[PDB]
Amino acid sequence: MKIKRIEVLINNGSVPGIPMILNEIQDAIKTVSWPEGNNSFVINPVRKGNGVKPIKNSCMRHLHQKGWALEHPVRIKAEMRPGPLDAVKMIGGKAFALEWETGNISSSHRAINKMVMGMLERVIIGGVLILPSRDMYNYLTDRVGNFRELEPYFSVWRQFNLKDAYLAIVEIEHDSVDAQVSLIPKGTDGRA
Amino acid sequence: MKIKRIEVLINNGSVPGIPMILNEIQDAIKTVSWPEGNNSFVINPVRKGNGVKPIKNSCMRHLHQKGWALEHPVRIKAEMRPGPLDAVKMIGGKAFALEWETGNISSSHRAINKMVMGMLERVIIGGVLILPSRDMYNYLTDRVGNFRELEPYFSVWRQFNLKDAYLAIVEIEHDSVDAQVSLIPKGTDGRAIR
DNA sequence: TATGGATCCATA
DNA sequence: TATGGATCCATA
Ligand SMILES: [Ca+2]
Ligand SMILES: [Ca+2]
Ligand SMILES: [Ca+2]
């Protein structure tokens, strides 16, 4: 998978291991490919024709190899029931969270909100969210969160006084297109 | 429909006209009825049994009649902008925003961020978000807006340093339940068909 | 029953 | 055509 850019929203104090985990995250994103077993991410360029669920898999596997916990239950407050984060690297006391978008754009707003809640409540040191470029997004499930559509709100997450916190958005994209490769399955395929 | 609770999240400096705005908003919410044409909102207490689409209708209508502008753009300077606000009133050469939420619960996070963006850029003086109680939510299409699921997030929203700002959440609810009223029809969005 | 999705519908 | 909305899903 290509990384087009990374927008660093918050980067206060010293996290460490930081570059070590940002190097891990990037190496992990780089392993993601299509079809399975290919050496790059080749997508079938059908408008809205590719599901988004399994795209992350190879990235989450590579992180596990590097000692991240996957689908890791978290409960930031007490008055919340727990929910899963895609991967987490425990760097002592607090959590470094990675997320790879599989929800509506509106649900991206909540993920960053929950990350910032984690940071403010002292349970999360850093958070990273991976979003499709608009170009990649055009071939994905209608209205999946995507980098361009969230971009107008970035100022919002720049307004916090957080000692020792890292918040970044990563923009990803397919390496190339090919009308002859398989569609990434959707949950609606064959009745479902 | 009735107003169950008003929860103020941000209150800084001076924003004139809040009690008047809050009254007009209550009056708007009061107009919302079921069955359509009724003088209250009676709901069928079937779990996830009721669609949401028509519920906003009378509220947004009452607001337009009282001078609210509907789908008012967020006039931030950048070319990359959020889309429109449900309704905006001018009070004193100042824009006041109203966001109605029967969307997915996640949609409320965008609505808040949109009104905060307007306030940061000093183009909006304040806003209110209206969304259902948990109690009503139990009878609506799954995973729509509900005040309870927003609560853990109030602490995060309270941290924005904005001079001259007002943001509040109005929790709304049906008037009663009747196991014999019509169900509110559902559309075919998302995973309804398959 | 609770949460974070995945997905398709409407539309100036 | 882009943005806001609505509807069940899978698994905790
Ligand atoms: Ca996730
Ligand atoms: Ca709207
Ligand atoms: Ca709305």
Side-chain angles (χ1 to χ4, degrees), chain B residues 97-162 164-167:
Chain B
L98 185 130
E99 276 286 279
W100 169 285
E101 268 297 344
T102 49
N104 193 285
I105 177 64
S106 55
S107 180
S108 285
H109 295 248
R110 163 177 57 208
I112 293 297
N113 282 157
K114 171 177 295 172
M115 285 179 298
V116 171
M117 209 54 217
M119 296 182 265
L120 280 161
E121 281 280 299
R122 317 276 317 152
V123 296
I124 261 63
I125 185 75
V128 300
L129 173 79
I130 308 160
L131 89 174
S133 71
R134 194 72 181 187
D135 276 358
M136 192 185 176
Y137 159 104
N138 291 145
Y139 316 129
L140 306 181
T141 122
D142 205 15
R143 309 310 286 111
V144 304
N146 67 98
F147 179 95
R148 193 194 89 174
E149 194 167 351
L150 281 198
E151 286 182 80
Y153 292 94
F154 291 2
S155 71
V156 33
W157 293 328
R158 278 183 174 124
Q159 309 275 333
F160 295 110
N161 264 233
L162 283 16
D164 307 310
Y166 179 92
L167 171 70

Side-chain angles (χ1 to χ4, degrees), chain A residues 71-76 80-85 88 95 114 123-124:
Chain A
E71 301 184 299
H72 182 260
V74 149
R75 194 210 290 261
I76 303 300
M80 313 174 69
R81 276 71 151 204
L85 280 153
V88 167
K114 165 151 120 111
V123 330
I124 289 180

Side-chain angles (χ1 to χ4, degrees), chain B residues 9-29 31-76 78-88 90-93 95-162 164-192:
Chain B
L9 293 190
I10 302 176
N11 185 39
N12 317 138
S14 71
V15 181
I18 302 314
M20 169 269 313
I21 268 159
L22 288 190
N23 184 61
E24 221 163 71
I25 291 168
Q26 173 154 16
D27 288 351
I29 294 166
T31 69
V32 176
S33 314
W34 192 262
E36 280 151 12
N38 207 7
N39 54 352
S40 71
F41 199 96
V42 193
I43 199 169
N44 199 317
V46 166
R47 184 172 277 139
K48 321 290 172 188
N50 294 281
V52 308
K53 195 189 209 200
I55 309 179
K56 73 183 80 53
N57 286 359
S58 294
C59 181
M60 303 318 296
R61 230 259 288 238
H62 186 82
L63 300 165
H64 186 73
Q65 279 168 335
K66 298 285 173 194
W68 291 70
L70 308 163
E71 293 307 309
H72 186 99
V74 189
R75 292 181 206 297
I76 81 169
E79 269 189 299
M80 287 185 207
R81 299 198 277 261
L85 285 161
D86 288 320
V88 169
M90 307 307 301
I91 317 298
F96 191 111
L98 185 130
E99 276 286 279
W100 169 285
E101 268 297 344
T102 49
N104 193 285
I105 177 64
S106 55
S107 180
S108 285
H109 295 248
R110 163 177 57 208
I112 293 297
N113 282 157
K114 171 177 295 172
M115 285 179 298
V116 171
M117 209 54 217
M119 296 182 265
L120 280 161
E121 281 280 299
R122 317 276 317 152
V123 296
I124 261 63
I125 185 75
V128 300
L129 173 79
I130 308 160
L131 89 174
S133 71
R134 194 72 181 187
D135 276 358
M136 192 185 176
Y137 159 104
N138 291 145
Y139 316 129
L140 306 181
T141 122
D142 205 15
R143 309 310 286 111
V144 304
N146 67 98
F147 179 95
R148 193 194 89 174
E149 194 167 351
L150 281 198
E151 286 182 80
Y153 292 94
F154 291 2
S155 71
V156 33
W157 293 328
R158 278 183 174 124
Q159 309 275 333
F160 295 110
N161 264 233
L162 283 16
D164 307 310
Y166 179 92
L167 171 70
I169 312 284
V170 182
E171 185 184 29
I172 65 172
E173 188 169 287
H174 52 270
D175 293 301
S176 45
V177 303
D178 187 320
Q180 247 78 226
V181 267
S182 55
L183 289 158
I184 309 184
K186 296 187 162 168
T188 63
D189 304 62
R191 305 295 307 266

